[PDB]
Amino acid sequence: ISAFLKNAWAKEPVLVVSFSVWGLAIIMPMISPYTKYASMINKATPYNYPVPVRDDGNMPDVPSHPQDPLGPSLDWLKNL
Amino acid sequence: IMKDVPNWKVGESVFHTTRWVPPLIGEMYGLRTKEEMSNANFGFTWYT
Amino acid sequence: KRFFESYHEVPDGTQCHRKTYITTALGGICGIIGSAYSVSLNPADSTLEAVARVGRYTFTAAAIGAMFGLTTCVSAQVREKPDDPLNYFIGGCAGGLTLGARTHSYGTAAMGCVYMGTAAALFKIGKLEGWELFPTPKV
Amino acid sequence: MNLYTVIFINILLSLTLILVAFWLPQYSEKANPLPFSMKFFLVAITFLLFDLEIALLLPLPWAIQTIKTSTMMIMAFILVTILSLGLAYEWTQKGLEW
Amino acid sequence: MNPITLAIIYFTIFLGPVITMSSTNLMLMWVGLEFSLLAIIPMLINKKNPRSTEAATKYFVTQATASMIILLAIVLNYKQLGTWMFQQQTNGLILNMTLMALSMKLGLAPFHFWLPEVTQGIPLHMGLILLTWQKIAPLSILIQIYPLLNSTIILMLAITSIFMGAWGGLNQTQMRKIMAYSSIAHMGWMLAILPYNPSLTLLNLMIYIILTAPMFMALMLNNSMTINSISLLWNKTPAMLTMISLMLLSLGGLPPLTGFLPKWIIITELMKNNCLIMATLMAMMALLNLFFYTRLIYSTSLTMFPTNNNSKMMTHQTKTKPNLMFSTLAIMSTMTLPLAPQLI
Amino acid sequence: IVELPTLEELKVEEVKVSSAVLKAAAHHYGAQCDKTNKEFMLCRWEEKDPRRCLKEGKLVNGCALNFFRQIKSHCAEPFTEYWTCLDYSNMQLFRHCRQQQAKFDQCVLDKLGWVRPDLGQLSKVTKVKTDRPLPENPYHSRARPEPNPVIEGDLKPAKHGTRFFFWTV
Amino acid sequence: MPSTFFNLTMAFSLSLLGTLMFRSHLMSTLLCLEGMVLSLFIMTSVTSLNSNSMSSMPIPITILVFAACEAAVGLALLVKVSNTYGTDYVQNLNLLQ
Amino acid sequence: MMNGRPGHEPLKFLPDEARSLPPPKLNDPRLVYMGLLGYCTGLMDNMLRMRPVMRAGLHRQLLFVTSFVFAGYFYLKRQNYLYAVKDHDMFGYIKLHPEDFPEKEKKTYAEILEPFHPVR
Amino acid sequence: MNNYIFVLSSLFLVGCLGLALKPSPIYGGLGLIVSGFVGCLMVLGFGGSFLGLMVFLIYLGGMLVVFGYTTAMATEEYPGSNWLILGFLVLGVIMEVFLICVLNYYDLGDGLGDWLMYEVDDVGVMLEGGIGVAAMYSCATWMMVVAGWSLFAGIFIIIEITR
Amino acid sequence: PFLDIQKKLGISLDRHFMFLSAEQPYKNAARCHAFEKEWIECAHGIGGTRAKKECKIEFDDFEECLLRYKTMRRMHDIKKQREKLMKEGKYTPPPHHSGREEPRP
């Protein structure tokens, strides 16, 4: 099997690449340290406006002000 | 003006909810200058 | 449509003119439809030939319509009995006979008379007994 | 609008240039000057079944920015693949071959 | 057929009705109908005989325009109600379109011309699929929308079909077309009760499937597309003569056999709903269907037609057997009547 | 007549400054003038009607003009050099006027004590406490109809059996 | 839109009358058949667009994708016919009578 | 019809509620019929395939008589439920909407006066 | 103008009437290619840049072109002068005007007013077709799969028919 | 539907997008999202036969949020009136028509 690839790399040297990159692209996402961020860098974009919720005093996390230390702070996207 | 003949009630919302119907482009500028209708109805498609 | 219905509104045997007119139209309408199917399928040879067939079927049907209307109305008039399947049967009887003639066949007149008249009579009974056709689902 | 003006001007230029072409000049048998290409038709619907392929692949530019990026990737790969396997069958069928 | 292709097609011919049935978004119901159209056309031209290409080209045009009309109904609804699905409010014309269109794909009544002709040019096998696994899909769409369709039209298409089917059948001598005509008729009864009791449509179908599937595998056991051909059944295979007799009389409504139940309960439901005008006329010409069924009975069983000498040669050779399905579907069909209450 | 506020009422001093300057002083307009702008939104999304939160609207049109008024006295000239280049672009990118940005930020870091937000500190949903009573029955939904009643009990073998034709079952 | 939606609908009916009134060549029909799919595609896209119903835009295209193959099948039947008769006239398709 | 009922099991064969109903006696005439219906299928098969009718496939004969019957118990078990639901549903309505289904008093013949047509 | 759409709509009907008079197989292809151009334009009118261009990209040059292609290969036998058809077509050109006319006097009407772009966000982004068509990959991933099988089994259906 | 293999399997491949009030991409609510809700939370638990008479207020409104025709008749009528009066000069293009009147942010 391994020496059959040798003529298929000498002659037919196209379909080899096309079935070597067809796949390579299926394994790069499953094995990369940085694939988690694509659904996150794309999740941070505030395209529409963030509606604020009414305060009850029962919500400690919700950052009261845009500059509170609380809330979704992305010091990640920076120097991702 | 434009409404002194009979059987007309000004501001006769055609819905029944009484909630805030976001006005339609038409009602907003329509009876206004021919320019306004396009500038609202064709301003963006025409570009920039 | 308020028209055709009128036929039923006035008591039978009365205002035959309207009756005959309405009945003639229905037959004629059927004539057109019938000719249409007859021309669409089993087409003709020349446009004129087919226009003729439309005419033939239309008139024949209009005729059966008229005599039905006329006979039933008059039979009721002369007999003075407005509600009687027999009036209609005589009418249907006649209608069939017109069909028979147009087709130039005594035999057809036979089946035509019996079958057609019976059908019309049943219409009268249907109206008299308030039979419902094509009823809405009431389960 | 502007686009209209341009595309319209572009036409007028084209027409004029054929207007002038048939008029500037101002018999002799000067004017005197087939089987089915089944292969061609095949190639043609191969292109139809593939052009529509692109039409379902053009959303990628705006789906890459979907939250479920993992889902898009998966959905796309299958399309590109199932279409490649189709082409591949054609290959074996030798339909691709001319 | 490269067995792979056979799989893809057959899967589609089977994914076609199944998507229709499972989905609620009408659109997805339309593409279920669309697939079925695409999958059936390859099989129809398998012999690729000159008759076949004619068959498929008709089936396809009739199927395609109806498919487009069904889509138009969905497109119109989308603008009369944002929903992608018929609702109480739906404009009446919107639903009537769907009835006509779907009555074309199913081939009922004044649109009954394509079926007899495509049933004539396709093999006996693909004949069955074209008659019974392609009726499930459209009927599903109708049965789902029954509350909303018109009682008048359905009835007219119902009665017409019964008549056309019966009258057409009387003259036909080609078996494939006798069956095509019967299917038009039975399809008629089915659509008659749809507005009133859909659940009975699903009985008048199954029974039709449990009756027609054995009947066709019978016609092909000896691959006879002629009555003369089925008449020499007594020499080719004598046993099937008994059940072929009962199944055909079962297809018509005669009382001891299973075939009476669909007609009986449809008549009971229509009288419960007061259509004693319509039901009566249907039952009467339904009796015309049995006449042509019994005329075939005469030729195949009650009378023995003369056979050719070479028939002795075919007897010698072992007859490839009829699948088991024939039996299980012949008996469950010819005699289940004693078990009607649980069927309905 | 559908309620439509009097034009007189709608009158409010207005920002009237082109989009470019707003885009320049926006990130500081998110830091400052936030409590006065989020409560408008918190009315706007809760009370779905522009005929009721006009109250807080006039507040937004107010705090903003306040924001700039300080910038106009405090640190106006370096602000003019900032948006004057930013408006030169076709999409008003910060990517170009990046030197004008710090020169305005250090001028405003020292004076007025403002610090421009970090990258993701305007996309978080702050919680704003307000007094507007909760707008119940928003959408003015007329009372709904009741569900069909529920037949109740347990199954018991059917009565007299399938009541079909003489099938004594 | 209400006005226009009419034109498109009648376009579909004029295309309906076309496919239900054949004349010689079949390729004309199939071509007409396609005229409907365009009218349906245009109407579906139009209402989806003025209802701002973006969740439904998938459909306008699914309609085209299915319609294209549908037509592919239709043309292969057509090629099959002018290979068996070579004239593609709806006229000779009558063996099944 | 019965679909759309509250609690309907969207794709289930026989909801557990059908446990409450009595199980079909294995010798219920119907299941016994299904048995005979089955034996006949078997015998018929042998016949169509040209085998000794009764003395062949004695294994199959069993598969048949035992497949049909198996099917029966579990079908009848359901059809029985369906019918039982029908009463639950029907009887309940008669009550929940009582006025529409009012009890009627039937006058003893003494009171009622049906006319007498004489045969003579 | 304001009748930006109507006029076009009218042209779309004219092209459909041309296809309906069943003109010569390829002379009418042009007809489709014309109304496809027209329908491409209307959708653009409503802001469906993507959906619009899509038609101009697939049905116009993909489907239609392949259609005539085949016409040339077969069914372009090019054996009633289309001019007769154009004669009739002209009749319809104004005959349709008649249909519209009755409702014209009856009169929506007076051209086209605000009967387009009913509601558009005067602020905001991501509002654009192609965001909706890209729901094939989020929240509408069943339309995508079934379209796949169409085209995929399409290959197998076509070859099988061709063979 | 006819065979609910979807509810059973719990999958929802065909239900999430059947009405205008379904989840629109990027939460861009469509026109009428308000009504259709009000017209389907009403008809929930009440079958159709009774979603067709008593829940008629919400459809009569939703039939005018989307068709938006009763409006046309109003506006179209208004239009004609203006026309007649204007022809006799009874009515004059409003200051709005005259433009200006302080077009404001």
Ligand SMILES: CCCCCCCCCCCCCCCCCC(=O)OC[C@H](COP(=O)(O)OCCN)OC(=O)CCCCCCCCCCCCCCCCC
């Ligand atoms: C409700 C009653 C309904 C009616 C029941 C009575 C009619 C039953 C149906 C008969 C229909 C066919 C009539 C014509 C049959 C002709 C048979 C024939 O020609 O003989 C050959 C045939 C096959 O031959 P083979 O078995 O291979 O060996 C002999 C080779 N010469 O030989 C055979 O086929 C042998 C096997 C024939 C089938 C046996 C059936 C026996 C009768 C069944 C009666 C059932 C009564 C049920 C009563 C229910 C009451 C509630």
